[PDB]
Structure formats: C-alpha cells, structure tokens
C-alpha cells in the first residue's frame with residue numbers, strides 16, 4: 001500500500017455505511033437524523049490540512065448531510081448520485097488531481113464503479129465479500145466507527161505526516177485547521 | 180437451500196428486529212424514529228428489479244414505517260397485524276404467487292405463524308432458539324445490520340442473478356431501478 | 359433457579375440499562391428519545407397474560423417513559439425514585455403479592471436495595487461485578503438487547519407456560535393480549 | 538495506579554468518544570441528539586459526593602451538552618476548546634487543586650495535550666494506539682459504554698470509598714447526592 005498511499009492528494013468518501021454505520025434514521029418525513037463519527041471528522045480536517053482534498057459521493061441527499069459537509073469545510077461533492085464512475089472523474093477534475101492520486105472508500109455494490117475509477121480503493125470492515133474483493137485494502141474498522149480515520153491515519157503516516165495525530169506538538173501546530 | 184431459493188418470486192419481511200435491530204425509539208407521542216439499514220434497502224431494490232416482489236408484514240404501524248415503505252417502492256403490506264398466518268396468505272394472493280414461491284424472514288414468536296404459511300423461512304442471527312428451530316435457514320447477520328441483504332444476496336445468487344451486486348457492470352445496468 | 363422461578367407472580371424492572379442499553383439521548387431540553395427493545399415488549403405482554411404482573415421502577419422520570427409504559431399496558435410503577443427498597447415493598451403491596459413471589463431485574467448500584475427487597479434478582483449481562491455478585495441469576499443478554507425477554511422466557515418456561523412463545527399455536531391463543 | 542489514584546481530587550473528562558461513543562447525531566441544524574451513558578452519570582455523582590470535583594473539556598459546544606452538564610450538577614467546564622493544555626491548567630486553578638491531583642480521560646489526538654497537563658491520564662478502550670501509548674491507564678470499556686464509570690469506580694476504590702457503589706447501605710447513605 002505504501003507506494004500508492006504516498007501519492008494520494010484526493011480522497012472521495014461514500015456516506016452511508018462508511019461515515020455512518022449504515023443506519024437510516026427515519027421519521028415521518030424521511031431521514032431525520034444522520035450519525036457521523038467524531039474521530040472521522042478530525043481525520044477529515046487532518047487530511048485537508050496536509051494538502052489532501054476530501055470529497056463526498058453519496059447516492060442519497062439530505063439537508064442533514066449537507067449540514068455535516070458544511071461543518072467539516074468540505075467543498076467538492078455530488079449527492080443523490082447512484083452512477084458513481086462518471087461522478088468520481090468529475091470530482092477529480094474539480095480537485096485538479098489524477099486517478100492515481102485519488103483514493104475512494106466505500107461499503108456496497110454502488111461503490112464498485114468508484115473503485116474502478118480511482119487508483120486506490122478501501123473497504124470498511126463490515127463490507128460484503130464482493131466489495132472486499134474489489135478494493136486494494138480492507139480496513140479493520142466497521143463503517144461509522146472510525147473507518148475513515150483509520151484510512152486517513154494510514155495515508156498521512158505513509159506520507160510522513162503522522163505528527164499531526166500522534167504527538168501533542170504536531171496536533172498543536174495545525175490546531176487552527178482542526179475546528 | 181438451493182432448490183427452494185431457486186423458485187422464490189416473493190419475499191415477505193417483518194420490520195422490528197429484522198429491518199431494524201429491535202430498538203423502538205420513543206418520544207412523548209410514541210415511536211419517533213425508526214432505524215433501517217442502507218444495504219438492506221439496496222437489497223430490496225435488487226430483488227424487485229430481478230422480478231421478485233417484496234412485502235412488509237408488521238405487528239406495529241407508524242407514519243415513519245409507511246414513509247420508508249414509500250421510499251423503497253414497496254406496494255404490498257399489512258401493518259399493525261399480529262396474526263400473521265392469514266396475513267401471509269392474503270399477501271401471496273395479491274402478489275400472484277404460491278406459498279412455495281414465498282420466503283419470509285422474522286425474529287420472534289409473532290413470526291412463527293408466518294414461518295408456517297410460507298415455503299421458505301429465514302431467521303436473523305440474534306433470533307431466539309425457538310425461532311431458529313422453526314426456520315429453514317438461520318442467517319449469520321444480526322437484525323437491522325444487513326440480515327435482509329444477506330438473504331436477498333442468497334436468493335439472487337441461487338437464481339443466477341448475482342451480477343447486479345457483485346460486478347460494477349451488473350449494478351450499472353439496473354441502476355435506474357436502484358433509487 | 360427453578361424453585362424460585364416457579365412461584366413468581368410479580369416482576370419489577372429498572373429502565374435505564376435494562377429495558378434500554380444505558381444510553382440517555384439528550385436534546386436541549388433533556389431526554390428526547392428513549393430506546394426500548396421490541397422483544398422485551400412482547401415478553402412483558404406474555405408475562406401479564408400468564409398472570410404475572412409487571413411493574414417499572416426507575417430513578418428517572420420522563421413523558422417518554424410514561425408513554426412506553428402506557429403502550430405496554432403497565433399499571434404499577436414509581437418513577438424518579440432513587441431509594442428503591444421502600445419502593446419495591448410498596449409495589450408488592452399494590453400487586454397483592456409477597457417478596458418471595460417477586461422478581462427484580464437491574465444493572466447498577468441503585469438497584470442493590472431492590473435486590474435485597476425482592477426474593478429473586480436478575481442482573482443484565484453488562485452489569486458491573488458488584489451488581490452481578492448481588493443477584494440470584496446473571497443473564498447472558500446485554501441490557502436493552504432482550505435481557506428482559508430472556509428473563510421472562512425463563513420464568514414462563516419454569517412455570518410450564520412456554521407455549522405462548524415457542525409454538526405458533528400457543529402464541530395464536532393469547533394473540534389478543536399481545537398488542 | 539494505586540499511588541496516583543489515591544491522590545486524585547479532580548477529574549476532567551472529554552465528551553465525544555468518552556461520555557459518548559463518538560457518534561454525532563446531526564439534523565439539518567447540526568447536532569440534534571447527544572447520547573450519554575446512565576452508569577457514567579451515576580459515577581459522576583459518586584465522585585462529586587466523595588469530594589472529587591468533575592469537569593468537562595470539549596472541542597465542541599452545544600445547548601444539548603450544556604443541558605447534560607446542568608443535569609449532572611457539573612460546575613467547571615470549557616466548551617468549543619480545541620487547545621486543551623491551557624484549558625486543563627485553568628480548570629485546575631478553578632478547582633483549587635494541582636496537576637498531580639488531577640486525572641483526565643480522553644480518546645483522540647486532541648486529548649494528547651490534556652494528557653501532558655494532568656498527572657494521571659486514562660484512555661477509553663476504543664482509543665487509537667497513539668492515544669493508548671500516551672496515557673497512564675487504558676480502560677477495558679469502550680467510550681460511551683461506561684468507560685467513565687469504570688474509571689470513577691477505580692478512583693473511589695483506590696481511596697477506600699467503594700461502599701457507595703458496591704453495597705446497598707453505602708449507596709443508601711449518599712442517596713440525596715445521587716439525583
């Protein structure tokens with residue numbers, strides 16, 4: 001993984017079952033709550049601060065997700081988008097990066113075309129076998145439990161930028177970019 | 180399981196403890212949130228697209244559940260229905276299928292008559308022993324964690340229709356029927 | 359456990375960490391959602407139908423809990439009550455039963471006086487060691503995951519009344535008392 | 538741990554991933570629900586009653602968190618505070634205690650400066666390796682599942698004050714200070 005992890009400048013993430021644990025919390029009007037993970041959020045800020053852009057690609061759209069996106073300072077994203085191959089290529093163009101500079105993390109069949117578009121692919125731990133087979137690296141953490149952060153930790157460390165998370169002094173240098 | 184799985188044209192599912200993990204999220208006015216699983220939802224759409232109808236049978240009713248049902252394009256259902264044997268037979272009549280073409284997935288005693296009505300029965304992994312004893316197949320996944328999708332995956336693969344989930348090209352052929 | 363389980367006519371249950379998993383879901387105004395378990399609810403109805411009364415004893419009170427209590431047909435209860443010894447004795451008096459006819463299920467220190475008041479005591483699986491030490495029986499299921507139902511199943515079976523849950527015909531005889 | 542645990546007079550806790558399991562439950566307007574743990578709450582009251590002050594230190598702020606803080610009788614706290622070293626020292630000054638009388642419990646990189654400021658540090662069980670490496674003691678319980686209570690139990694027992702939790706009589710002596 002080292003040689004691909006080293007050249008990542010852009011990360012695209014699916015939401016449901018990656019940034020969340022797959023649960024859709026309905027009320028009478030549809031999605032009412034989305035549950036994201038706090039250590040994921042910090043990982044997102046760490047990547048951005050380390051000159052790695054972050055994008056969101058989801059087959060669902062909601063004002064809730066759009067709010068979490070704003071909270072995190074995420075700029076590039078396509079929502080309600082079920083055909084994800086063309087979506088990935090469009091996001092890379094906006095990011096000013098190539099496919100081999102791009103990493104994608106997913107959990108289900110809808111992500112299979114995204115895995116094909118991006119140079120590096122990750123699956124969350126609770127992903128089905130046919131998804132795990134299609135990615136470069138299967139993560140040890142379940143979706144919505146820090147799976148993104150585990151990935152972001154890997155990418156940063158590969159590029160020698162682990163101080164932001166493994167030392168008090170490293171964190172307290174990018175602290176203005178953390179929230 | 181192959182010979183029964185091959186002839187399934189209709190799936191009836193219980194909600195609480197199957198499509199959910201059994202939790203009822205109350206507020207002051209009763210049920211306030213229901214949590215469904217995203218990979219279950221995709222499995223539901225995949226079955227329908229593969230000419231397998233899907234129905235919901237629940238001993239509880241709520242505007243929340245009725246919304247999730249609408250979101251998924253599910254047509255046939257009986258809610259607030261605790262006597263489930265007659266309910267299953269009525270649903271099969273509406274579906275235009277027979278009992279041996281019908282599969283049911285449940286988690287508790289209330290589902291025991293449904294298991295008797297349908298030709299093929301599944302239990303979620305966290306079902307009690309007396310429920311596991313009564314079904315044809317006990318699933319490895321807990322309710323609300325993809326138990327339905329595990330079943331739907333099994334049914335499709337038995338009928339040679341796994342491409343919709345295990346290949347990017349298969350998924351990107353039924354993509355208009357996925358949401 | 360058989361000889362005590364056989365003579366139980368009354369069950370008193372704690373809420374947080376027994377009927378729930380211990381989580382308190384706050385909004386700005388305090389408790390906003392309480393999550394109960396569906397298989398617990400059915401167990402509650404089964405006990406009542408088998409001439410075993412059910413009571414709730416909680417150190418917290420909320421309109422949410424009061425709603426779930428009404429939904430279940432539970433009549434006897436004391437809420438916001440942190441001194442639970444006197445509370446248990448008062449509930450037994452209302453139930454028309456004795457201490458050796460009474461079972462209590464708890465998860466934390468506040469339940470320790472309740473264990474002392476009632477003849478039979480249960481601890482949920484995730485209870486601390488000092489709680490497990492104080493009860494007659496430690497359950498295998500975690501609080502809010504069917505711990506009550508596991509107990510209710512035990513009590514009924516001890517008294518020869520397991521048909522209501524382990525047979526379709528048994529369930530479909532008390533079906534009007536199930537919801 | 539005994540010699541440090543014995544002289545603790547002040548505990549500072551992080552919220553997300555310690556008092557909660559790391560999940561941020563968004564609606565359209567941001568954080569909509571925070572989930573705390575009931576056995577944690579009792580541990581908080583037990584510490585305070587045993588002349589150990591409790592403080593909250595979080596990089597996030599919300600009316601929800603401020604409500605839970607009020608519910609628990611917690612007085613000292615700094616919210617929305619991402620640089621936590623100076624924050625810890627300020628809290629100790631308000632508490633009238635020293636650094637070697639102070640214990641901190643965290644789960645992520647943002648807590649690394651807090652670990653350095655306080656004499657005794659704890660990590661929740663699901664904390665990353667670089668956090669576990671930085672603390673005096675790694676807890677066996679996951680964040681939001683009683684990790685705080687496990688710590689509070691340890692501190693009290695070290696100081697000979699375990700009766701409040703391991704005996705009915707001990708609990709029923711500080712019962713007015715428990716809620």
Ligand SMILES: O=C(O)[C@@]1(O)C[C@@H](O)[C@@H](O)[C@@H]([C@H](O)CO)O1
Nearest residue numbers: 037038041042178179596597647
């Ligand atoms: O919202 C989050 O997920 C995030 O990780 C984001 C960060 O901005 C950071 O604020 C962290 C906490 O505030 C750190 O204690 O929350």
Ligand SMILES: O=C(O)[C@@]1(O)C[C@@H](O)[C@@H](O)[C@@H]([C@H](O)CO)O1
Nearest residue numbers: 059060110216217220221357358
């Ligand atoms: O709501 C869902 O559960 C579902 O699985 C349904 C599908 O329509 C699909 O939209 C999927 C996601 O949108 C795929 O990324 O959500």
Ligand SMILES: O=C(O)[C@@]1(O)C[C@@H](O)[C@@H](O)[C@@H]([C@H](O)CO)O1
Nearest residue numbers: 238239289395396399400536537
């Ligand atoms: O609300 C429940 O927990 C309960 O178990 C109660 C029962 O009344 C019953 O209705 C069951 C479901 O309705 C059975 O499918 O819900």
Ligand SMILES: O=C(O)[C@@]1(O)C[C@@H](O)[C@@H](O)[C@@H]([C@H](O)CO)O1
Nearest residue numbers: 417418468574575578579715716
């Ligand atoms: O809100 C809680 O977490 C707390 O633990 C706090 C305590 O005040 C106590 O009231 C307990 C329950 O009320 C005990 O049954 O709740």
